[PDB]
Design a binder for these strands. Structure first.
Length: 48
DNA sequence: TTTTTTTTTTTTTTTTTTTTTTTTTTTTTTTTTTTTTTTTTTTTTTTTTTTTTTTTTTTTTTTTTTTTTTTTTTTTTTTTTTTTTTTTTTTTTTTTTTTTTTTTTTTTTTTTTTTTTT
């Protein structure tokens, strides 16, 4: 996608969490694995 | 000249309250430990021409079991109502600006006296 698209994320509990691609973290081709739970509001047992 | 009534602050020490020294629990803070990023080079992996024998798709025909199909009655869907959460106007409070009004503290230096400890 491009840098200015919007995201409709759907979790395992089937919840609509809105976001924009400005927000996820970007880095080089290396050991990159930022945290999932920090940006959206999610429960303990749910995955996008 | 003697004698009689009343008034209060002290002998007060005890009850009530206040002040002042204390130490359990949730919120900070320094340490070690584990996630990130950049270089060397290094055998190692991986990109790109040529040849080759392969093995799956397209001439043609067959059927059968998934695609047709109509209809009963469920049950998810939608409606209204009310509660819970989110979010934004509203209000309140506090801070800074520059001329005014007010104050308050810590130490040297010597020499003499109180004021506790041994």
């Amino acid at each position: 996608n491009t840098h200015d698209h919007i995201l409709c994320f759907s979790s395992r509990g089937r919840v609509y969490s809105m976001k924009v691609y400005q927000l996820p973290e970007a880095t080089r081709g290396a050991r990159g694995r930022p945290i999932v739970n920090l940006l959206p509001l999610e429960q303990d047992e749910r995955i996008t």
